Structure formats: C-alpha cells, structure tokens
Amino acid sequence: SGIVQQQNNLLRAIEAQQHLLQLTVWGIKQLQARIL
Amino acid sequence: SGIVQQQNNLLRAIEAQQHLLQLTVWGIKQLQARIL
Amino acid sequence: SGIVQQQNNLLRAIEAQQHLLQLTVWGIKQLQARIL
Amino acid sequence: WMEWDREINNYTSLIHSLIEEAQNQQEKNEQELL
Amino acid sequence: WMEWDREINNYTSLIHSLIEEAQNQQEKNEQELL
Amino acid sequence: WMEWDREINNYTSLIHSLIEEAQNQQEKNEQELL
C-alpha cells in the first residue's frame, strides 16, 4: 500500500513539474520574441 | 508487475523532463549571450 | 527491496530536477528584468 | 531556435504520452491492491 | 508576466508539498520493509 | 550568472548520476519479478 501511494506522490510531482516546464518554455519564447 | 511497470513509466518521464530541462537551460544561455 | 530503492532514486531525481527548475525560473526573471 | 522549438515539441509529446500511461497504470495498481 | 509569476508560485508550492509528502512516505516504506 | 552556471552543472551531474542508477535498478527489478 505505501508503495502504490509513493508512486501516486511521484506521478503527481512529475505532473506538477511538467506544468512548471511549460511555464519556463513559455517565458523563454516571450523573451525570445521581445529580443528579435 | 504493475508497480515495476509504473516505475518504468516514471523513470521514462523523468528522463524526458531532463531533456526538456537541458533545452530550457540552453535557451536561457542563448538569450543571455544575446543580451550581453 | 529493489522497488523501495527505485522510489528513492526517482524521488531524488525529482528533487534534483526541482532545483534545476528553480534555477531556470530565476534565469528567466533576470533576463526579464534586464529586458524591461 | 527552429531546432530548439522542434526538440521541445518532440519531448513534450513523449512526456504527455508517458504521463497518460502512468495515470492509467496508477489506477490499475490502486484497484489491484484490493 | 504577472499571470506567469502567479502560476509559477502556485505550482512551486504544490511541488514542494508533494516532495515533503514523498519524503515522509519514503521513510515509512523503508521502515515497513523490516 | 557565474554562480548560476555552476549550480546548473552541479545539479545536472547529480541528476545524470541518479538516472543511470535508476536505469540499473530498473533492470534488476524487472529480472527479479521472474
């Protein structure tokens, strides 16, 4: 049970880090366009 | 079996997020150099 | 045992990727301020 | 930057693929504990 | 950029939350192997 | 930016270390199911 539960916790952390990665990718393209 | 399989899936997601992180690090140094 | 051990390894990778994400977020705000 | 864009998109799809698959597996694993 | 900042902070707290919880679970799971 | 570079490199090596180790463990765990 504690293992299936840990995997939930890691899956959730991975998903939330994916959101953060799409936010930094966004931020970079905006700076890129402004720089152009 | 489903647990070893989930760990595969998370390891793979972590690896693919690592690629994305090296891509945003790259993008940032390029903007940094252009800004300099 | 090898499973609890893998989960350690992934948790640790997630934590270290979180550090990297806070570093790219930082880098982006610095470029943003310089751009402003 | 055009190659950058492309490798972003490729890895973003891989990732999305992998997360859906892990959500499905996560559900099965929770069921099969019972 | 103001919305960007805000979604960063929201996801950063979620993440931090999730990592603490996984450190606690990691400890329990290591104990319970014994 | 010079400190930024350095903390990037330190965490990037840690991560790479951790992923290799998890690929090895992943292999063992797949074997030992049998």
mmCIF file with all atom_site columns, C-alpha atoms in Angstrom:
data_model
loop_
_atom_site.group_PDB
_atom_site.id
_atom_site.type_symbol
_atom_site.label_atom_id
_atom_site.label_alt_id
_atom_site.label_comp_id
_atom_site.label_asym_id
_atom_site.label_entity_id
_atom_site.label_seq_id
_atom_site.pdbx_PDB_ins_code
_atom_site.Cartn_x
_atom_site.Cartn_y
_atom_site.Cartn_z
_atom_site.occupancy
_atom_site.B_iso_or_equiv
_atom_site.pdbx_formal_charge
_atom_site.auth_seq_id
_atom_site.auth_comp_id
_atom_site.auth_asym_id
_atom_site.auth_atom_id
_atom_site.pdbx_PDB_model_num
ATOM 1   C CA . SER A 1 1  ? 0.000  0.000   0.000   1.00 0.00 ? 1  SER A CA 1
ATOM 2   C CA . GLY A 1 2  ? 2.760  2.529   0.861   1.00 0.00 ? 2  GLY A CA 1
ATOM 3   C CA . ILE A 1 3  ? 4.482  1.841   -2.422  1.00 0.00 ? 3  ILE A CA 1
ATOM 4   C CA . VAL A 1 4  ? 1.358  2.442   -4.647  1.00 0.00 ? 4  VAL A CA 1
ATOM 5   C CA . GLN A 1 5  ? 0.917  5.507   -2.567  1.00 0.00 ? 5  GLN A CA 1
ATOM 6   C CA . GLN A 1 6  ? 4.505  6.730   -3.193  1.00 0.00 ? 6  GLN A CA 1
ATOM 7   C CA . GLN A 1 7  ? 4.053  6.214   -6.895  1.00 0.00 ? 7  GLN A CA 1
ATOM 8   C CA . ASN A 1 8  ? 0.994  8.445   -6.759  1.00 0.00 ? 8  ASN A CA 1
ATOM 9   C CA . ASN A 1 9  ? 3.058  11.067  -4.976  1.00 0.00 ? 9  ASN A CA 1
ATOM 10  C CA . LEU A 1 10 ? 5.832  10.888  -7.565  1.00 0.00 ? 10 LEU A CA 1
ATOM 11  C CA . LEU A 1 11 ? 3.417  10.892  -10.512 1.00 0.00 ? 11 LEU A CA 1
ATOM 12  C CA . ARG A 1 12 ? 1.836  13.940  -9.055  1.00 0.00 ? 12 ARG A CA 1
ATOM 13  C CA . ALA A 1 13 ? 5.203  15.623  -8.635  1.00 0.00 ? 13 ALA A CA 1
ATOM 14  C CA . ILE A 1 14 ? 6.173  14.832  -12.155 1.00 0.00 ? 14 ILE A CA 1
ATOM 15  C CA . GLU A 1 15 ? 2.890  16.332  -13.412 1.00 0.00 ? 15 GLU A CA 1
ATOM 16  C CA . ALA A 1 16 ? 3.349  19.478  -11.437 1.00 0.00 ? 16 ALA A CA 1
ATOM 17  C CA . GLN A 1 17 ? 6.982  19.778  -12.732 1.00 0.00 ? 17 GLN A CA 1
ATOM 18  C CA . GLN A 1 18 ? 5.690  19.409  -16.250 1.00 0.00 ? 18 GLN A CA 1
ATOM 19  C CA . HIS A 1 19 ? 3.482  22.423  -15.674 1.00 0.00 ? 19 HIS A CA 1
ATOM 20  C CA . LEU A 1 20 ? 6.477  24.332  -14.478 1.00 0.00 ? 20 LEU A CA 1
ATOM 21  C CA . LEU A 1 21 ? 8.410  23.273  -17.513 1.00 0.00 ? 21 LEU A CA 1
ATOM 22  C CA . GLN A 1 22 ? 5.686  24.504  -19.836 1.00 0.00 ? 22 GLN A CA 1
ATOM 23  C CA . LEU A 1 23 ? 5.781  27.815  -17.934 1.00 0.00 ? 23 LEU A CA 1
ATOM 24  C CA . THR A 1 24 ? 9.588  28.235  -18.405 1.00 0.00 ? 24 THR A CA 1
ATOM 25  C CA . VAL A 1 25 ? 9.287  27.292  -22.109 1.00 0.00 ? 25 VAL A CA 1
ATOM 26  C CA . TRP A 1 26 ? 6.608  29.947  -22.481 1.00 0.00 ? 26 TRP A CA 1
ATOM 27  C CA . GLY A 1 27 ? 8.720  32.553  -20.623 1.00 0.00 ? 27 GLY A CA 1
ATOM 28  C CA . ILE A 1 28 ? 11.660 31.794  -22.913 1.00 0.00 ? 28 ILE A CA 1
ATOM 29  C CA . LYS A 1 29 ? 9.683  32.290  -26.181 1.00 0.00 ? 29 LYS A CA 1
ATOM 30  C CA . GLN A 1 30 ? 8.319  35.576  -24.933 1.00 0.00 ? 30 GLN A CA 1
ATOM 31  C CA . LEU A 1 31 ? 11.804 36.833  -24.126 1.00 0.00 ? 31 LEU A CA 1
ATOM 32  C CA . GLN A 1 32 ? 12.949 35.410  -27.481 1.00 0.00 ? 32 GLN A CA 1
ATOM 33  C CA . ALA A 1 33 ? 10.256 37.374  -29.362 1.00 0.00 ? 33 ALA A CA 1
ATOM 34  C CA . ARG A 1 34 ? 10.982 40.544  -27.478 1.00 0.00 ? 34 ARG A CA 1
ATOM 35  C CA . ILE A 1 35 ? 14.676 40.089  -28.272 1.00 0.00 ? 35 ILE A CA 1
ATOM 36  C CA . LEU A 1 36 ? 14.137 39.513  -32.002 1.00 0.00 ? 36 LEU A CA 1
ATOM 37  C CA . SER B 1 1  ? 4.203  -6.399  -12.044 1.00 0.00 ? 1  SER B CA 1
ATOM 38  C CA . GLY B 1 2  ? 2.126  -3.181  -12.328 1.00 0.00 ? 2  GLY B CA 1
ATOM 39  C CA . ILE B 1 3  ? 4.388  -1.445  -9.861  1.00 0.00 ? 3  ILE B CA 1
ATOM 40  C CA . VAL B 1 4  ? 7.702  -2.270  -11.707 1.00 0.00 ? 4  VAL B CA 1
ATOM 41  C CA . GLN B 1 5  ? 5.864  -1.138  -14.750 1.00 0.00 ? 5  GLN B CA 1
ATOM 42  C CA . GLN B 1 6  ? 4.838  2.210   -13.168 1.00 0.00 ? 6  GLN B CA 1
ATOM 43  C CA . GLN B 1 7  ? 8.399  2.819   -12.107 1.00 0.00 ? 7  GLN B CA 1
ATOM 44  C CA . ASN B 1 8  ? 9.474  2.362   -15.711 1.00 0.00 ? 8  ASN B CA 1
ATOM 45  C CA . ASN B 1 9  ? 6.856  4.888   -16.751 1.00 0.00 ? 9  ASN B CA 1
ATOM 46  C CA . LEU B 1 10 ? 8.018  7.412   -14.161 1.00 0.00 ? 10 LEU B CA 1
ATOM 47  C CA . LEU B 1 11 ? 11.711 6.872   -14.931 1.00 0.00 ? 11 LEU B CA 1
ATOM 48  C CA . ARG B 1 12 ? 10.923 7.475   -18.527 1.00 0.00 ? 12 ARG B CA 1
ATOM 49  C CA . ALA B 1 13 ? 9.025  10.646  -17.695 1.00 0.00 ? 13 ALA B CA 1
ATOM 50  C CA . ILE B 1 14 ? 11.827 11.911  -15.574 1.00 0.00 ? 14 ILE B CA 1
ATOM 51  C CA . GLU B 1 15 ? 14.291 11.278  -18.426 1.00 0.00 ? 15 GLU B CA 1
ATOM 52  C CA . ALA B 1 16 ? 12.160 13.076  -20.923 1.00 0.00 ? 16 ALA B CA 1
ATOM 53  C CA . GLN B 1 17 ? 11.764 16.041  -18.469 1.00 0.00 ? 17 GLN B CA 1
ATOM 54  C CA . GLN B 1 18 ? 15.510 16.153  -18.102 1.00 0.00 ? 18 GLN B CA 1
ATOM 55  C CA . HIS B 1 19 ? 15.787 16.631  -21.841 1.00 0.00 ? 19 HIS B CA 1
ATOM 56  C CA . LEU B 1 20 ? 13.336 19.457  -21.615 1.00 0.00 ? 20 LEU B CA 1
ATOM 57  C CA . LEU B 1 21 ? 15.303 20.988  -18.812 1.00 0.00 ? 21 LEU B CA 1
ATOM 58  C CA . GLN B 1 22 ? 18.504 20.886  -20.831 1.00 0.00 ? 22 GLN B CA 1
ATOM 59  C CA . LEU B 1 23 ? 16.586 22.592  -23.659 1.00 0.00 ? 23 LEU B CA 1
ATOM 60  C CA . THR B 1 24 ? 15.366 25.472  -21.399 1.00 0.00 ? 24 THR B CA 1
ATOM 61  C CA . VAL B 1 25 ? 18.885 25.883  -19.934 1.00 0.00 ? 25 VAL B CA 1
ATOM 62  C CA . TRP B 1 26 ? 20.235 26.134  -23.466 1.00 0.00 ? 26 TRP B CA 1
ATOM 63  C CA . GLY B 1 27 ? 17.530 28.653  -24.483 1.00 0.00 ? 27 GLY B CA 1
ATOM 64  C CA . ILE B 1 28 ? 18.380 30.781  -21.448 1.00 0.00 ? 28 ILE B CA 1
ATOM 65  C CA . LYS B 1 29 ? 22.151 30.969  -22.208 1.00 0.00 ? 29 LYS B CA 1
ATOM 66  C CA . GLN B 1 30 ? 21.448 31.947  -25.781 1.00 0.00 ? 30 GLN B CA 1
ATOM 67  C CA . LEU B 1 31 ? 19.171 34.767  -24.669 1.00 0.00 ? 31 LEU B CA 1
ATOM 68  C CA . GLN B 1 32 ? 21.780 35.651  -22.023 1.00 0.00 ? 32 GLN B CA 1
ATOM 69  C CA . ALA B 1 33 ? 24.534 35.926  -24.666 1.00 0.00 ? 33 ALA B CA 1
ATOM 70  C CA . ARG B 1 34 ? 22.369 37.942  -26.985 1.00 0.00 ? 34 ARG B CA 1
ATOM 71  C CA . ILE B 1 35 ? 21.531 40.255  -24.081 1.00 0.00 ? 35 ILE B CA 1
ATOM 72  C CA . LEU B 1 36 ? 25.158 40.777  -23.026 1.00 0.00 ? 36 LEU B CA 1
ATOM 73  C CA . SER C 1 1  ? 13.592 -4.058  -1.555  1.00 0.00 ? 1  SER C CA 1
ATOM 74  C CA . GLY C 1 2  ? 14.580 -3.064  -5.131  1.00 0.00 ? 2  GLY C CA 1
ATOM 75  C CA . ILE C 1 3  ? 11.303 -1.256  -5.586  1.00 0.00 ? 3  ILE C CA 1
ATOM 76  C CA . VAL C 1 4  ? 11.595 0.915   -2.380  1.00 0.00 ? 4  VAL C CA 1
ATOM 77  C CA . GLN C 1 5  ? 15.073 1.555   -3.570  1.00 0.00 ? 5  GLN C CA 1
ATOM 78  C CA . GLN C 1 6  ? 13.920 2.678   -7.060  1.00 0.00 ? 6  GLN C CA 1
ATOM 79  C CA . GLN C 1 7  ? 11.412 5.013   -5.498  1.00 0.00 ? 7  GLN C CA 1
ATOM 80  C CA . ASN C 1 8  ? 14.230 6.605   -3.528  1.00 0.00 ? 8  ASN C CA 1
ATOM 81  C CA . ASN C 1 9  ? 16.165 7.031   -6.751  1.00 0.00 ? 9  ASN C CA 1
ATOM 82  C CA . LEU C 1 10 ? 13.208 8.640   -8.511  1.00 0.00 ? 10 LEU C CA 1
ATOM 83  C CA . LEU C 1 11 ? 12.354 10.885  -5.553  1.00 0.00 ? 11 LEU C CA 1
ATOM 84  C CA . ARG C 1 12 ? 15.908 12.017  -5.542  1.00 0.00 ? 12 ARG C CA 1
ATOM 85  C CA . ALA C 1 13 ? 15.814 12.715  -9.264  1.00 0.00 ? 13 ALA C CA 1
ATOM 86  C CA . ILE C 1 14 ? 12.641 14.660  -8.942  1.00 0.00 ? 14 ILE C CA 1
ATOM 87  C CA . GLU C 1 15 ? 14.195 16.761  -6.154  1.00 0.00 ? 15 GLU C CA 1
ATOM 88  C CA . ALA C 1 16 ? 17.272 17.489  -8.155  1.00 0.00 ? 16 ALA C CA 1
ATOM 89  C CA . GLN C 1 17 ? 15.083 18.454  -11.196 1.00 0.00 ? 17 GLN C CA 1
ATOM 90  C CA . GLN C 1 18 ? 13.146 20.799  -8.974  1.00 0.00 ? 18 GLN C CA 1
ATOM 91  C CA . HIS C 1 19 ? 16.382 22.573  -8.154  1.00 0.00 ? 19 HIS C CA 1
ATOM 92  C CA . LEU C 1 20 ? 17.087 22.886  -11.821 1.00 0.00 ? 20 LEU C CA 1
ATOM 93  C CA . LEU C 1 21 ? 13.642 24.250  -12.406 1.00 0.00 ? 21 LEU C CA 1
ATOM 94  C CA . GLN C 1 22 ? 14.104 26.906  -9.749  1.00 0.00 ? 22 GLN C CA 1
ATOM 95  C CA . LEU C 1 23 ? 17.394 27.819  -11.459 1.00 0.00 ? 23 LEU C CA 1
ATOM 96  C CA . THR C 1 24 ? 15.735 28.265  -14.915 1.00 0.00 ? 24 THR C CA 1
ATOM 97  C CA . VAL C 1 25 ? 12.890 30.299  -13.345 1.00 0.00 ? 25 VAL C CA 1
ATOM 98  C CA . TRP C 1 26 ? 15.490 32.531  -11.727 1.00 0.00 ? 26 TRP C CA 1
ATOM 99  C CA . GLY C 1 27 ? 17.442 32.890  -15.007 1.00 0.00 ? 27 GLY C CA 1
ATOM 100 C CA . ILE C 1 28 ? 14.236 33.875  -16.800 1.00 0.00 ? 28 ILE C CA 1
ATOM 101 C CA . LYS C 1 29 ? 13.303 36.670  -14.320 1.00 0.00 ? 29 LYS C CA 1
ATOM 102 C CA . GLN C 1 30 ? 16.783 38.108  -14.530 1.00 0.00 ? 30 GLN C CA 1
ATOM 103 C CA . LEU C 1 31 ? 16.614 38.226  -18.317 1.00 0.00 ? 31 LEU C CA 1
ATOM 104 C CA . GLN C 1 32 ? 13.068 39.607  -17.982 1.00 0.00 ? 32 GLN C CA 1
ATOM 105 C CA . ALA C 1 33 ? 14.267 42.450  -15.718 1.00 0.00 ? 33 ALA C CA 1
ATOM 106 C CA . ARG C 1 34 ? 17.187 43.247  -17.946 1.00 0.00 ? 34 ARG C CA 1
ATOM 107 C CA . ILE C 1 35 ? 14.811 43.327  -20.918 1.00 0.00 ? 35 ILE C CA 1
ATOM 108 C CA . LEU C 1 36 ? 12.285 45.645  -19.250 1.00 0.00 ? 36 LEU C CA 1
ATOM 109 C CA . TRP D 2 1  ? 15.776 28.365  -32.356 1.00 0.00 ? 1  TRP D CA 1
ATOM 110 C CA . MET D 2 2  ? 13.879 26.448  -35.023 1.00 0.00 ? 2  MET D CA 1
ATOM 111 C CA . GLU D 2 3  ? 15.616 23.200  -33.981 1.00 0.00 ? 3  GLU D CA 1
ATOM 112 C CA . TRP D 2 4  ? 15.033 24.196  -30.338 1.00 0.00 ? 4  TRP D CA 1
ATOM 113 C CA . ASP D 2 5  ? 11.289 24.510  -30.977 1.00 0.00 ? 5  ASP D CA 1
ATOM 114 C CA . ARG D 2 6  ? 11.164 21.174  -32.622 1.00 0.00 ? 6  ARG D CA 1
ATOM 115 C CA . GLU D 2 7  ? 13.017 19.151  -29.921 1.00 0.00 ? 7  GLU D CA 1
ATOM 116 C CA . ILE D 2 8  ? 10.731 20.905  -27.307 1.00 0.00 ? 8  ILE D CA 1
ATOM 117 C CA . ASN D 2 9  ? 7.667  19.620  -29.151 1.00 0.00 ? 9  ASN D CA 1
ATOM 118 C CA . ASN D 2 10 ? 9.017  16.173  -29.563 1.00 0.00 ? 10 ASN D CA 1
ATOM 119 C CA . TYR D 2 11 ? 9.897  15.784  -25.892 1.00 0.00 ? 11 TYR D CA 1
ATOM 120 C CA . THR D 2 12 ? 6.643  17.472  -24.754 1.00 0.00 ? 12 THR D CA 1
ATOM 121 C CA . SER D 2 13 ? 4.604  14.864  -26.646 1.00 0.00 ? 13 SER D CA 1
ATOM 122 C CA . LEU D 2 14 ? 6.724  11.999  -25.341 1.00 0.00 ? 14 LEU D CA 1
ATOM 123 C CA . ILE D 2 15 ? 6.158  13.344  -21.788 1.00 0.00 ? 15 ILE D CA 1
ATOM 124 C CA . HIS D 2 16 ? 2.399  13.792  -22.213 1.00 0.00 ? 16 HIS D CA 1
ATOM 125 C CA . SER D 2 17 ? 2.228  10.205  -23.633 1.00 0.00 ? 17 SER D CA 1
ATOM 126 C CA . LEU D 2 18 ? 4.142  8.964   -20.602 1.00 0.00 ? 18 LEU D CA 1
ATOM 127 C CA . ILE D 2 19 ? 2.021  10.753  -18.060 1.00 0.00 ? 19 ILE D CA 1
ATOM 128 C CA . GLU D 2 20 ? -1.287 9.462   -19.500 1.00 0.00 ? 20 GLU D CA 1
ATOM 129 C CA . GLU D 2 21 ? 0.116  5.939   -19.454 1.00 0.00 ? 21 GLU D CA 1
ATOM 130 C CA . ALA D 2 22 ? 1.218  6.376   -15.814 1.00 0.00 ? 22 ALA D CA 1
ATOM 131 C CA . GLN D 2 23 ? -2.205 7.735   -14.815 1.00 0.00 ? 23 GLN D CA 1
ATOM 132 C CA . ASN D 2 24 ? -3.786 4.549   -16.301 1.00 0.00 ? 24 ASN D CA 1
ATOM 133 C CA . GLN D 2 25 ? -1.268 2.282   -14.612 1.00 0.00 ? 25 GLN D CA 1
ATOM 134 C CA . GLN D 2 26 ? -1.764 4.195   -11.387 1.00 0.00 ? 26 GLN D CA 1
ATOM 135 C CA . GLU D 2 27 ? -5.457 3.371   -11.473 1.00 0.00 ? 27 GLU D CA 1
ATOM 136 C CA . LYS D 2 28 ? -4.891 -0.341  -12.183 1.00 0.00 ? 28 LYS D CA 1
ATOM 137 C CA . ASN D 2 29 ? -2.354 -0.587  -9.390  1.00 0.00 ? 29 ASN D CA 1
ATOM 138 C CA . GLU D 2 30 ? -4.773 1.010   -6.932  1.00 0.00 ? 30 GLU D CA 1
ATOM 139 C CA . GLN D 2 31 ? -7.525 -1.478  -7.954  1.00 0.00 ? 31 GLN D CA 1
ATOM 140 C CA . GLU D 2 32 ? -5.297 -4.484  -7.807  1.00 0.00 ? 32 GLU D CA 1
ATOM 141 C CA . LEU D 2 33 ? -4.250 -3.810  -4.153  1.00 0.00 ? 33 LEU D CA 1
ATOM 142 C CA . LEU D 2 34 ? -7.772 -4.881  -3.353  1.00 0.00 ? 34 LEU D CA 1
ATOM 143 C CA . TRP E 2 1  ? 4.243  38.115  -16.860 1.00 0.00 ? 1  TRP E CA 1
ATOM 144 C CA . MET E 2 2  ? 2.121  38.805  -13.794 1.00 0.00 ? 2  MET E CA 1
ATOM 145 C CA . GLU E 2 3  ? -0.027 35.725  -14.537 1.00 0.00 ? 3  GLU E CA 1
ATOM 146 C CA . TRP E 2 4  ? 3.191  33.815  -15.311 1.00 0.00 ? 4  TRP E CA 1
ATOM 147 C CA . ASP E 2 5  ? 4.580  34.673  -11.867 1.00 0.00 ? 5  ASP E CA 1
ATOM 148 C CA . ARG E 2 6  ? 1.450  33.560  -10.189 1.00 0.00 ? 6  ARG E CA 1
ATOM 149 C CA . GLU E 2 7  ? 1.098  30.124  -11.891 1.00 0.00 ? 7  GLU E CA 1
ATOM 150 C CA . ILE E 2 8  ? 4.868  29.563  -11.112 1.00 0.00 ? 8  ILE E CA 1
ATOM 151 C CA . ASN E 2 9  ? 4.174  30.152  -7.422  1.00 0.00 ? 9  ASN E CA 1
ATOM 152 C CA . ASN E 2 10 ? 1.134  28.002  -7.365  1.00 0.00 ? 10 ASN E CA 1
ATOM 153 C CA . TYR E 2 11 ? 2.861  25.043  -8.998  1.00 0.00 ? 11 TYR E CA 1
ATOM 154 C CA . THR E 2 12 ? 6.057  25.546  -6.932  1.00 0.00 ? 12 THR E CA 1
ATOM 155 C CA . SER E 2 13 ? 4.050  25.207  -3.707  1.00 0.00 ? 13 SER E CA 1
ATOM 156 C CA . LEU E 2 14 ? 2.152  22.182  -4.996  1.00 0.00 ? 14 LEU E CA 1
ATOM 157 C CA . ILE E 2 15 ? 5.528  20.578  -5.879  1.00 0.00 ? 15 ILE E CA 1
ATOM 158 C CA . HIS E 2 16 ? 7.147  21.375  -2.524  1.00 0.00 ? 16 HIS E CA 1
ATOM 159 C CA . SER E 2 17 ? 4.020  19.928  -0.780  1.00 0.00 ? 17 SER E CA 1
ATOM 160 C CA . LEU E 2 18 ? 4.352  16.793  -2.888  1.00 0.00 ? 18 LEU E CA 1
ATOM 161 C CA . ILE E 2 19 ? 8.028  16.298  -2.250  1.00 0.00 ? 19 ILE E CA 1
ATOM 162 C CA . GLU E 2 20 ? 7.693  16.605  1.554   1.00 0.00 ? 20 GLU E CA 1
ATOM 163 C CA . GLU E 2 21 ? 4.875  14.069  1.468   1.00 0.00 ? 21 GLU E CA 1
ATOM 164 C CA . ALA E 2 22 ? 7.015  11.692  -0.636  1.00 0.00 ? 22 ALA E CA 1
ATOM 165 C CA . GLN E 2 23 ? 9.984  12.076  1.731   1.00 0.00 ? 23 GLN E CA 1
ATOM 166 C CA . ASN E 2 24 ? 7.673  11.023  4.629   1.00 0.00 ? 24 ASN E CA 1
ATOM 167 C CA . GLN E 2 25 ? 6.233  8.116   2.678   1.00 0.00 ? 25 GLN E CA 1
ATOM 168 C CA . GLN E 2 26 ? 9.731  7.137   1.625   1.00 0.00 ? 26 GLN E CA 1
ATOM 169 C CA . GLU E 2 27 ? 10.727 6.808   5.262   1.00 0.00 ? 27 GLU E CA 1
ATOM 170 C CA . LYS E 2 28 ? 7.661  4.727   6.196   1.00 0.00 ? 28 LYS E CA 1
ATOM 171 C CA . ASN E 2 29 ? 8.209  2.420   3.251   1.00 0.00 ? 29 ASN E CA 1
ATOM 172 C CA . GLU E 2 30 ? 11.836 1.869   4.245   1.00 0.00 ? 30 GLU E CA 1
ATOM 173 C CA . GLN E 2 31 ? 10.768 1.018   7.843   1.00 0.00 ? 31 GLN E CA 1
ATOM 174 C CA . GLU E 2 32 ? 7.992  -1.272  6.811   1.00 0.00 ? 32 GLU E CA 1
ATOM 175 C CA . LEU E 2 33 ? 10.315 -3.492  4.671   1.00 0.00 ? 33 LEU E CA 1
ATOM 176 C CA . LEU E 2 34 ? 11.648 -4.639  8.003   1.00 0.00 ? 34 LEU E CA 1
ATOM 177 C CA . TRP F 2 1  ? 25.314 34.238  -13.843 1.00 0.00 ? 1  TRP F CA 1
ATOM 178 C CA . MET F 2 2  ? 28.625 32.606  -12.971 1.00 0.00 ? 2  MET F CA 1
ATOM 179 C CA . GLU F 2 3  ? 27.100 31.117  -9.792  1.00 0.00 ? 3  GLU F CA 1
ATOM 180 C CA . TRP F 2 4  ? 24.011 30.200  -11.846 1.00 0.00 ? 4  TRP F CA 1
ATOM 181 C CA . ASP F 2 5  ? 26.171 28.242  -14.302 1.00 0.00 ? 5  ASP F CA 1
ATOM 182 C CA . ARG F 2 6  ? 27.871 26.414  -11.542 1.00 0.00 ? 6  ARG F CA 1
ATOM 183 C CA . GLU F 2 7  ? 24.738 25.284  -9.609  1.00 0.00 ? 7  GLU F CA 1
ATOM 184 C CA . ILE F 2 8  ? 23.269 24.152  -13.029 1.00 0.00 ? 8  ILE F CA 1
ATOM 185 C CA . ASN F 2 9  ? 26.305 21.932  -13.578 1.00 0.00 ? 9  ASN F CA 1
ATOM 186 C CA . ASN F 2 10 ? 26.267 20.551  -10.119 1.00 0.00 ? 10 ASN F CA 1
ATOM 187 C CA . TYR F 2 11 ? 22.595 19.600  -10.245 1.00 0.00 ? 11 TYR F CA 1
ATOM 188 C CA . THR F 2 12 ? 22.875 18.304  -13.847 1.00 0.00 ? 12 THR F CA 1
ATOM 189 C CA . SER F 2 13 ? 25.581 15.841  -12.772 1.00 0.00 ? 13 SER F CA 1
ATOM 190 C CA . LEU F 2 14 ? 23.635 14.772  -9.693  1.00 0.00 ? 14 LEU F CA 1
ATOM 191 C CA . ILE F 2 15 ? 20.604 14.136  -11.965 1.00 0.00 ? 15 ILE F CA 1
ATOM 192 C CA . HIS F 2 16 ? 22.570 12.190  -14.583 1.00 0.00 ? 16 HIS F CA 1
ATOM 193 C CA . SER F 2 17 ? 24.099 10.083  -11.730 1.00 0.00 ? 17 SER F CA 1
ATOM 194 C CA . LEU F 2 18 ? 20.605 9.420   -10.410 1.00 0.00 ? 18 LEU F CA 1
ATOM 195 C CA . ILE F 2 19 ? 19.128 8.441   -13.731 1.00 0.00 ? 19 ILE F CA 1
ATOM 196 C CA . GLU F 2 20 ? 21.904 5.926   -14.538 1.00 0.00 ? 20 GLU F CA 1
ATOM 197 C CA . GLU F 2 21 ? 21.432 4.371   -11.112 1.00 0.00 ? 21 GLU F CA 1
ATOM 198 C CA . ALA F 2 22 ? 17.654 4.143   -11.683 1.00 0.00 ? 22 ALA F CA 1
ATOM 199 C CA . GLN F 2 23 ? 18.148 2.558   -15.119 1.00 0.00 ? 23 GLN F CA 1
ATOM 200 C CA . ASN F 2 24 ? 20.318 -0.149  -13.442 1.00 0.00 ? 24 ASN F CA 1
ATOM 201 C CA . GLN F 2 25 ? 17.828 -0.681  -10.640 1.00 0.00 ? 25 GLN F CA 1
ATOM 202 C CA . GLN F 2 26 ? 15.035 -0.768  -13.189 1.00 0.00 ? 26 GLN F CA 1
ATOM 203 C CA . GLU F 2 27 ? 16.729 -3.666  -14.938 1.00 0.00 ? 27 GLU F CA 1
ATOM 204 C CA . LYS F 2 28 ? 17.308 -5.629  -11.711 1.00 0.00 ? 28 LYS F CA 1
ATOM 205 C CA . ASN F 2 29 ? 13.715 -5.126  -10.647 1.00 0.00 ? 29 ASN F CA 1
ATOM 206 C CA . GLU F 2 30 ? 12.451 -6.399  -13.998 1.00 0.00 ? 30 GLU F CA 1
ATOM 207 C CA . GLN F 2 31 ? 14.669 -9.530  -13.696 1.00 0.00 ? 31 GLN F CA 1
ATOM 208 C CA . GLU F 2 32 ? 13.730 -10.235 -10.140 1.00 0.00 ? 32 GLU F CA 1
ATOM 209 C CA . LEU F 2 33 ? 9.951  -10.339 -10.921 1.00 0.00 ? 33 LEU F CA 1
ATOM 210 C CA . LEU F 2 34 ? 10.784 -13.598 -12.616 1.00 0.00 ? 34 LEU F CA 1
#
